């Protein structure tokens, strides 16, 4: 019974809408534009992870460092608790030493 | 629930079809059917 008895409504995808059609444009902004701009400057997203990557602990540390003062109170409390938990887990748990 | 299993019906039926000629709940309930089907095989 864990199965739907009707076909789901058809999902139509426009492969040639503007977003898909122009996807990838300016990814070579650096090597084709005399390196005035780095391609990572094209990234739109959270201010604390534009052109940067890390595990959950590093992401949380960076978020606290960069926008911690602007965070809501309980969100910041949750982030502090999460950093503490992730520190304990990554530095004290695991199969490997 | 990013990724959920949608085939569980067919996965269950693959065993229940071999269990259909058993006695009692072994022919209906997958938990009991799978044990008796393995023994049968």
């Amino acid at each position: 019974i864990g199965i739907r008895l009707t076909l789901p409504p058809p999902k139509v995808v426009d492969r040639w809408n503007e977003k898909r059609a122009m996807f990838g444009v300016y990814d070579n902004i650096g090597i084709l534009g005399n390196f005035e701009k780095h391609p990572k400057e094209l990234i739109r997203g959270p201010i604390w992870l534009r052109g940067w990557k890390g595990n959950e602990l590093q992401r949380c540390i960076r978020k606290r460092k960069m926008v911690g003062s602007r965070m809501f109170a309980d969100d910041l409390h949750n982030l502090n608790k999460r950093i503490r938990y992730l520190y304990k887990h990554f530095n004290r748990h695991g199969k490997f030493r | 629930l990013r990724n959920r299993v949608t085939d569980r019906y067919f996965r269950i039926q693959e065993v229940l079809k071999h269990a259909r000629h058993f006695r009692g709940r072994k022919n209906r309930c997958y938990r009991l059917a799978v044990r008796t089907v393995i023994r049968a095989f």
């Binding site: 199965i3 739907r4 008895l5 076909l7 789901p8 | 959920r4 949608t6 067919f10």
Partner: peptide, 26 residues
Amino acid sequence: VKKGFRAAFRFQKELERQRLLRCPPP
């Protein structure tokens, strides 16, 4: 509801097979 189409289509195919077995066309 679970997202996806393949399981639903498989179930429709099995329903069609069972329907053909129960009431085969003349």
